[PDB]
């Protein structure tokens, strides 16, 4: 991806040999920058509604004539709006993004009838998985605000049209916008962005209200719809070794009808439970999480004990084989993330907006068994463990039990 600048907008593109292009506008407008809970979700859902030049209806009917597709999502850091189309249709898609950023009519009826109901279905679908809920609850305990804000709009905190219009006034500005083109000729994109996004406000960099603070604790979400448990550890100094540690501890199986050879996968034997270790870098803080879902609260409890033990055992000793396995699993995870257009866009988006130079999968560091064990030791001995239980919470573990 050749980084350049076109009329004050950061543009990154990589030409390829395929008939299909992906253009993604990445906005510094994710939930950590939210002003009101849920506004970044609502603003994401308000993309490609009625603009002054082109109605939502006209946009969708024309998009079907190009056979293009539209994908949007919100993270803690970004709102990502992606279009996928045939290479030659690039100018239409650039102009469409320009209309959205410059000329969206944020109309109250769209909020009530279109945007908010879709936002609500989005959340209900995500929450059907209790592991999603547990990991969201864990971020809320660990960070409280900023990274602890909810990503998604909820019913209890109603977002108003004035809320969304204010946030959009900040976010939809040259300082918060990056354009990322996969299989787009870089010279052609710079020319088009330079004509289309010229009259966009300059605005100012959106900032997190307040510094990231770390906290420990417990969240207990009573659902009747399945059981999960996250064990998170907030990280004050995000380091790349936690990727290797997450991949080492593992949890999911690497082949069908098997359990897996990872320490966390081996913790599930004899139970209908699954486990996944994850590491989330957010620049200034991070979160190392182990999520366990299952239908039996008794089994989840059982696995949770083994999970904590596994992390302590890692802090003691890792073999050379295991450290190499972690390098392999981690390089692979990095490679597939840079391939998937969803995550790809946000990776370069973070390089363009924030300035965090991307780590190419081929340049993923190999951590010695010493470095891995030291990282695990630093986690087992954390002052601020977070535990989020979801489901039959009376039967799930507590932080002090773990």
């Amino acid at each position: 991806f050749s980084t350049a600048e076109a009329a004050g907008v950061k543009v990154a593109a990589q030409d390829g040999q395929s008939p299909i292009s992906d253009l993604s506008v990445v906005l510094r407008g994710g939930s950590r920058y939210a002003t009101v809970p849920g506004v970044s979700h609502i603003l994401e859902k308000f993309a490609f509604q009625n603009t002054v030049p082109k109605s939502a209806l006209r946009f969708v009917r024309e998009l079907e004539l190009f056979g293009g597709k539209l994908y949007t999502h919100t993270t803690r850091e970004h709102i990502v709006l992606r279009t996928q189309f045939l290479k030659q249709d690039l100018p239409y898609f650039v102009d469409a993004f320009a209309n959205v950023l410059k000329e969206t009519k944020f109309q109250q009826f769209e909020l009530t009838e279109r945007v908010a109901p879709v936002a609500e279905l989005d959340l209900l679908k995500r929450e059907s998985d209790p592991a999603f809920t547990a990991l969201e609850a864990a971020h809320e305990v660990a960070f409280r605000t900023g990274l602890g804000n909810s990503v998604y709009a909820q019913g209890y905190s109603p977002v108003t049209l004035e809320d969304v219009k204010e946030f959009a006034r900040q976010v939809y500005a040259k300082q918060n916008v990056a354009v990322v083109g996969n299989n787009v000729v870089p010279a052609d994109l710079q020319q088009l962005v330079g004509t289309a996004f010229a009259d966009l406000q300059e605005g100012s960099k959106v900032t997190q209200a307040g510094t990231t603070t770390l906290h420990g604790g417990e969240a207990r979400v009573r659902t009747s719809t399945g059981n999960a448990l996250t064990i998170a550890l907030p990280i004050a100094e995000p380091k790349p070794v936690y990727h290797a540690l997450a991949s080492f501890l593992g949890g999911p199986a690497s082949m069908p009808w098997s359990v897996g050879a990872s320490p966390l996968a081996q913790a599930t034997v004899g139970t209908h439970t699954s486990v996944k270790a994850t590491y989330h870098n957010y620049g200034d803080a991070g979160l190392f999480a182990i999520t366990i879902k299952g239908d039996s609260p008794a089994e989840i409890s059982q696995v949770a004990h083994k999970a904590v033990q596994a992390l302590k055992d890692t802090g003691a000793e890792v073999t050379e084989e295991q450290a190499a396995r972690a390098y392999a699993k981690s390089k692979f995870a990095a490679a597939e993330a840079f391939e998937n257009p969803d995550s790809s866009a946000s990776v370069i988006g973070m390089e363009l907006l924030s300035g965090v130079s991307r780590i190419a999968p081929e340049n993923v560091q190999k951590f010695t068994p010493a470095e891995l064990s030291e990282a695990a030791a630093q986690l087992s001995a954390s002052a601020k463990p977070v535990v989020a239980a979801v489901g039959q919470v009376h039967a799930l573990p507590f932080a002090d039990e773990l």
């Binding site: 024309e62 004539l65 690039l90 100018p91 052609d188």
Partner: protein, 75 residues
């Protein structure tokens, strides 16, 4: 490179357009034949229908040319 999709709006009225209606023109034709045959069949007994239409059909038309002998007719 393509800047705009290529299309026009065809004239329409009450949700009908010429491409659609033109597909149904033959069907109206057959329905009209059905209605014609049915109507004619319904009035086949009317003497005027026989005199003016049915008796004039070649070959077949003699089916409707029938005379009561004067000896058998009170009127």
């Amino acid at each position: 490179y393509v800047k705009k999709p290529s299309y026009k709006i065809v004239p329409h009225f009450l949700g009908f357009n010429i491409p659609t209606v033109s597909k149904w023109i033959p069907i109206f034709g057959i329905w009209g034949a059905a209605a014609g045959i049915g109507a004619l069949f319904l009035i086949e007994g009317v003497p005027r229908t026989r005199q003016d239409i049915l008796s004039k059909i070649p070959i077949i038309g003699e089916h409707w040319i029938r005379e009561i002998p004067a000896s058998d007719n009170p009127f």
